[PDB]
């Protein structure tokens, strides 16, 4: 039963190695253990096959799960105590043929969230970001997958808006960060505690500020928007292919455009692209046609270079140390506010914003590759 | 558990400041106790995080909830009418990164009862209000905020029809919205006297007029409606914010649609949207697609301009000049009674009245926005 | 021993003949013994009811089932080895008037899983296929009728990404495709662990890759793809007679159409037609009744050729041997994603998809039959007509 | 691991529910359905309380041969079918209008019944995607049968009535078979 302690080491190290998640998972003889370093699970160690049930006992005990329910999966709130952690970690266990799988999404701290600028918001792009989060109320749409960086933006906004004078309350599946000035709540749509339910719970906590981990049901958008419309500042996320689509998407989702318009101040498209570690960065030259389409033109193409995440100790072995986000910012002026209610397509909205000086995910991903931040490997893999 | 010391310094100040809520915040080392006042927080007292947990149990105690269960969210409400303390507390807890937030929402002092014309309903609504009360039987259902809408306005209906010569009674817990000429009941769910039980007497006593302060039981919803079936004037408060919603909800309560449909004669709503300066107004597009999606009369879809303040020494500071009363009257005819059974949507059931000139919150609101008094955004903020 | 020889040798042959499952099907003297060859049971042997008791008991003894109870249903799991075989088995029984029935499922190991390059794509579409499944997140939807070979395709991609280094996680019933080091969840619906409960846990179990070996539970489809909708890499097994239809099927399974337009990277509708056994692959046909029903291209009619499963023993007496998957690949580009975000039907998606290169399921089969793998007759059976 | 699944008698809700689950994973659930009409057999799972997700994934088609008293062909009495009877039934036009009933008057080939023993009325319902929607929606036996029936497809009602309308059976009997 060695993992009664080993797991705690996994959990501890997941924080120390800058992982977002803790995983202890079995093999035929031993158990594969990984930390989600810079967004990807890495081979931390292994532990004895039988020890996997000890692992389970650790993760179940710390979060109050029925220690005996190794027959079906359960989840909870880990009052986790080891090293750097004094965190309600986001616990789950699941029975597997070689012993039950043990997981804790890390409940990271405010210090683990890159700023609303740091993520890579180009001057004009950032100005628009600020226009939105500086309002006393309204909605900010952010969009992409887990690993889109939307979490970083969303909770970096909290770092920039969740103050002592604002009742910040978040809605997250599960809570990813531990931030001051805020009451950050754990959400589970599979249990019926969807973001729509959590949004009602949120409003009953009488907030000034809201963060929403995912807009999925029409209601998650609509009630996050209601919060804005009850005088709150609302920051919320979707999974679309652009900023423009976040508006189009809320219309596609049946989120009444008049509520989108009532609150919407602006929209951020977002994607993480892995960031090349300076201890492994390798210069390579990109293709002119790809580059034309990505927004370079001839002179930049002649001098264009990409930087590859070749691999080093300082990148967790991923080739990249951390990730940066690709950013596209739309401000809802009246041409756009019209576009919201008119049900305009993502192309229509994006092109208006580009006319106004907005850079797209495609142009930004590229620029970051050219800059020495990433490569048109990761960019392309993680962009539109 | 004191804990309560900090909370109590706050129930003192929060009630004294006419706060919207008392916030026991599950923070990193501590617990903030904050005051949401005039729409936003200011901090007042601080507990240790150990005391957070103590308070989570305290508010669960006040509602008779499972106080031992410090990890899972629960709710209810309590009659906090102890002199200086004269606001009900909405009980809610919600689990975060450091334990549940403990909430004592201030269920704002009744602010008693308006004489319904006082609402400032557009003429096509008010005169029809008068028309609805000219047929004093069945259900006259009203929505809106505690202290500025719920029983505030359903009792306004009573004030206009429930004369001393009518057997009129209400159900409240505690009684706050008071009308001379009328009986007002305190519900004692603790005794087993839930609002359903209170209603069982209202039905059994054969009144001319029945009032439900909060339709808060399957049996409450059912009984109020059963009484209405026979023609009792069952005026009732439905703790939601829109007449259109109120028209179909009792079916969700398990109430037979026979009695619901047979019962209704009209449903009202009211809102506080924020006004603008007018003098220092900012032209904002009354976008017709917004307005069309809303289902507004063309008089408002096309016949319009919105105005926003600049935030603005004549507003403020959100760009709006204080609270603006917006109203609705969904007059119920035979076709509406068919719609109740059908379960027509809030937009549709609302749209029907709007197209008759009966300005709904959505029209009376948006109308007022479209007239340049407020913005469609603030009205949509509330006419969601 | 007589009991060991039947079980060990039928199992050894079950795998050699490409069965998916071994069946001992009770009869009043004699029990039909069949192998689920190419997706359907075939005459391996027969067995006496005396052997139902001895052999069904062996299945039960192996499985961990109750060897006496002719009045209750059963299920379990073992590891099996003899001759050329070292592959796990799923064991189950059900009381029968003839003596209790038994099945031993061939729980193919990871070493039995094909590559992404074995999915039959022509150069253009293959390069795109590769580009699609090589992505770090999103769903690659693998679809088709029961008897489609979906677990190979499903696991060929899992395998691509199934390194113990990464948190690869898949739901099995019971576990078969090991590679240890990747999570191999074993459902237990009696406890509450259905495939949906399992995936519910997969989301809560935050692996890098979410896989469903068999979506028997429609909620499993919802959740597996939900994992993609949320940003995980997803590979999963779902019914479809048209890849465009598969996209619509995701919408029908509760997978949000809106997030699908971002999360779906590719769709593949498959089906098995029986391979003409390589040991008796006689050049015959294409047949005019078959051609008429199918709509075969002249390129395929007058150049490409069919074969007849004349008879080769390891075919179970039919002449057909080996599952032949057909691969209708739909690359999910902007037209498809728009059709998806718009919530479009199989027809609407298919038509834009067709214009964008979606050779259909029926057509891919026609081509492949004539490439000398199967018979168009089999192509008829699994599609039209 | 069925290719083909059978129920000797689907006698209850757990059985209907599970039989339908049994079909869901792609197996041919052939079954004794406690019914007298093929289209009725299709709708029935909803009626049984079968969880509808199983119903949607399960149904492919229905077989009938329900017997009618066979008209005594050799003393068959001309009876006009009512073409409205036939239309209302939903038959394929020719089998409405050119159609003619008979009834036996009693005979050396039927005795005091008017019918020459019995006739098995034919039917094949086929559940395509539109029928799938109809089943889940709770559509009637007449509607499901009427649809499958087109293109001259025989049903307990169309074949039945069709043969009734030749003088093999009486529309009456057929209608009793397909009410």
Numbering used by the authors:
A (entry chain A), B (entry chain D): 505 to 888
C (entry chain F): 505 to 889
D (entry chain C): 710 to 888
Q: What did the paper state?
A:
A third vital component of the TFP biogenesis system is the assembly ATPase (PilF in T. thermophilus). The TFP assembly ATPases are part of the extensive AAA+ superfamily which form molecular motors, using the energy from ATP hydrolysis to drive mechanical transformations. The domain structure of T2SS and TFP biogenesis ATPases is similar, in that they comprise one or more N1 or GSPII domains at the N-terminus, followed by a C-terminal (CTD) and N2 domain- which comprise the ATP binding site. Here we present a combination of X-ray crystallographic and cryoelectron microscopy single particle reconstructions of the PilF hexamer in two states which are used to build molecular models for the complete PilF hexamer and chart its structural transition on binding of ATP.
